[PDB]
Design a protein around this motif. Structure first.
Motif, short mmCIF file in Angstrom:
data_model
loop_
_atom_site.label_atom_id
_atom_site.label_comp_id
_atom_site.label_asym_id
_atom_site.label_seq_id
_atom_site.Cartn_x
_atom_site.Cartn_y
_atom_site.Cartn_z
N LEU A 9 0.85 -1.19 0.00
CA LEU A 9 0.00 0.00 0.00
C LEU A 9 0.88 1.24 0.00
CD1 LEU A 9 -3.11 0.67 0.30
CD2 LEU A 9 -2.51 1.33 2.63
N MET A 12 2.46 2.04 -3.34
CA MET A 12 1.38 2.60 -4.14
C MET A 12 1.20 4.09 -3.85
SD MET A 12 -2.31 0.69 -4.52
CE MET A 12 -1.44 -0.87 -4.37
N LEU A 13 1.28 4.47 -2.58
CA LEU A 13 1.16 5.88 -2.21
C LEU A 13 2.29 6.70 -2.82
CD1 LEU A 13 0.21 7.25 1.25
CD2 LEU A 13 2.15 8.23 0.02
N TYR A 57 -12.16 17.41 -11.18
CA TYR A 57 -11.36 16.62 -10.24
C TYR A 57 -12.05 15.31 -9.86
CZ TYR A 57 -8.19 15.67 -6.35
OH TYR A 57 -7.27 15.10 -5.50
N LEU A 58 -13.36 15.34 -9.64
CA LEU A 58 -14.08 14.18 -9.11
C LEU A 58 -15.20 13.69 -10.01
N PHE A 61 -14.36 11.07 -12.87
CA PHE A 61 -14.28 9.70 -12.37
C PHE A 61 -15.66 9.20 -11.96
CE2 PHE A 61 -11.52 6.31 -10.80
CZ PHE A 61 -12.40 5.62 -9.98
N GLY A 62 -16.48 10.07 -11.38
CA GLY A 62 -17.79 9.66 -10.91
C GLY A 62 -18.85 9.57 -11.99
N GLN A 63 -19.13 10.69 -12.65
CA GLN A 63 -20.21 10.76 -13.62
C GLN A 63 -19.74 11.50 -14.87
OE1 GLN A 63 -23.61 12.58 -11.66
NE2 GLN A 63 -23.05 11.63 -9.70
N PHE A 102 -0.23 1.00 -10.58
CA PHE A 102 -0.65 0.30 -9.38
C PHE A 102 -0.55 -1.19 -9.58
CE2 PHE A 102 -3.74 3.73 -7.72
CZ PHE A 102 -2.66 4.45 -7.26
N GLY A 103 -0.96 -1.67 -10.74
CA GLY A 103 -0.91 -3.08 -11.04
C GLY A 103 0.51 -3.61 -11.02
N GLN B 63 -21.81 5.83 -7.70
CA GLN B 63 -21.97 7.20 -8.16
C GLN B 63 -21.13 8.13 -7.29
OE1 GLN B 63 -26.20 8.10 -8.15
NE2 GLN B 63 -26.70 5.98 -8.71
N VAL B 64 -20.75 9.26 -7.87
CA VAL B 64 -19.94 10.25 -7.16
C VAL B 64 -20.81 10.96 -6.13
N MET B 87 -12.39 10.35 0.40
CA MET B 87 -12.82 9.55 -0.74
C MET B 87 -11.75 9.42 -1.82
SD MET B 87 -16.14 9.96 -3.23
CE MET B 87 -15.36 11.34 -4.06
N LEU B 88 -11.26 10.54 -2.36
CA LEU B 88 -10.39 10.47 -3.53
C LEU B 88 -9.01 9.94 -3.19
CD1 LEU B 88 -11.44 13.84 -5.18
CD2 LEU B 88 -12.11 11.54 -5.89
N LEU B 93 -7.62 4.36 -3.51
CA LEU B 93 -6.41 3.63 -3.26
C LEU B 93 -6.76 2.20 -2.86
CD1 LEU B 93 -3.55 4.01 -3.51
CD2 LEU B 93 -3.37 4.83 -1.17
N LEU B 97 -6.12 -1.34 -4.99
CA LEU B 97 -5.24 -2.32 -4.39
C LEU B 97 -5.91 -3.69 -4.43
CD1 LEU B 97 -3.67 -2.16 -0.85
CD2 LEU B 97 -5.27 -3.91 -1.52
N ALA B 100 -5.77 -5.01 -7.94
CA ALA B 100 -4.47 -5.51 -8.30
C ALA B 100 -4.30 -6.93 -7.79
CB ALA B 100 -3.40 -4.62 -7.72
#
Lengths: 116, 116
Positions: A9, A12-13, A57-58, A61-63, A102-103, B63-64, B87-88, B93, B97, B100
């Protein structure tokens, strides 16, 4: 069993930290655009930014952006490439690139398990 | 052809079980936060929890959060980091993970096919 998880983890960070540079470049590049093109003027730059800063920003990814396309005749012709390159070309590219990293990090960590 | 699928599915379930510990830690950590910060008081802790417990567990994947940001001047300044880290930063993360780990389990199982 749970030992490698926190280390993996952690790596990953670090990868997220490195990817933040690219993300910030993209964020500035397209936020300033959206502000200049989508609407004219604002309560300084902060007002225009914060107006729709939440979306790139969000929300992406969300909608999917629904009202953005509707809000947008040379301006009509030039609007489409803007958004097209803005979201479907680069953001998707960047997010997938991060996911690939990440993978690989998880793969290398779990590969060398029981020594870490 | 279908033989390895159930075994590989089974190993994946074990991986989910191990990842549940991390997920539970995160869930407690941020649910208690949301309850304390977002609103004041409740019909004990159960009422406040169940009020919005549905969102962190499933909505984030689905959903966001839209109304959460609107619902949230030192409190105004300190609200943004809360959600941002909530959240983000961590959920994304953690979910990646887990993903993966699934990829690696399937890879190792399918690699050694026809012996299992």
């Amino acid at each position: 069993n749970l030992g490698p998880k926190i280390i993996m983890l952690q790596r990953m960070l670090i990868d997220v930290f490195f990817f933040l540079f690219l993300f910030a470049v993209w964020m500035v590049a397209f936020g300033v655009a959206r502000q200049g093109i989508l609407r004219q003027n604002e309560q300084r730059w902060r007002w225009i930014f914060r107006s729709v800063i939440y979306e790139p920003y969000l929300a992406m990814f969300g909608q999917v952006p629904s009202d953005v396309d509707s809000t947008t005749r040379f301006p009509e012709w030039i609007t489409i490439p803007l958004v097209c390159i803005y979201m479907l070309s680069t953001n998707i590219l960047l997010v997938n690139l991060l996911v690939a990293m990440f993978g690989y990090t998880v793969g290398i960590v779990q590969e060398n398990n029981d020594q870490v």
